Amino acid sequence: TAEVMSHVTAHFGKTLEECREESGLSVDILDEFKHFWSDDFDVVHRELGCAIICMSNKFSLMDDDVRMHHVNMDEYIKSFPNGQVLAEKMVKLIHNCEKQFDTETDDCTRVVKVAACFKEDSRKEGIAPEVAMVEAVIEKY
Ligand SMILES: CCC/C=C\C=C\CCCCCCCCCO
Ligand SMILES: [Mg+2]
């Protein structure tokens, strides 16, 4: 659900700053990872694709070929409150996007294209949070 995705996003986003330099991702492109979900944030930059690889690697969410590791992703998602309601759909949805971009061999570019597809399909399927839901989790600390 969108509520569960708010919790996943809020945690996953903590590795933005440590990944920023190696990804070449300007603060001007993305200042805080929660804005990935803004209606009018365009998910396009190769650097954001590099960042997402870097951030995923932190939680072993990539397989040897820089695609989603399905098992590790499922285990990560279920580590959040009610995570089991989202885990099957989210993997299925991401993997469907990956198949559509399998002919992009540049890893950063492939991953940003996959991210954009995942964002758009997440809205269609009802698992996209609003920024405010993401902030509400972050703000509990
Ligand atoms: C992905 C788990 C963190 C939650 C929200 C973050 C979304 C931004 C990344 C888009 C999809 C990432 C999945 C890796 C794509 C593999 O090709
Ligand atoms: Mg490769």
From Swiss-Prot:
Disulfide bonds: 19-54, 50-108, 97-117
A Pfam entry, by short name: PBP_GOBP
Any single GO BP term: sensory perception of smell
Tissue-specificity statement: Detected in antenna (at protein level). Expressed at high levels in antenna.
InterPro entries, sorted: Odorant/phero-bd_Lep, PBP/GOBP, PBP_GOBP_sf
Disulfide bond recorded as keyword: yes
Keyword list, A-Z: Disulfide bond, Olfaction, Sensory transduction, Signal, Transport
GO molecular function, one term: odorant binding
Function: Present in the aqueous fluid surrounding olfactory sensory dendrites and are thought to aid in the capture and transport of hydrophobic odorants into and through this fluid.
Quaternary organization: Homodimer.
Family indicated by similarity: Belongs to the PBP/GOBP family.
Designated name of the protein: General odorant-binding protein 2
Originating organism: Bombyx mori
Native organism taxonomy: Eukaryota, Metazoa, Ecdysozoa, Arthropoda, Hexapoda
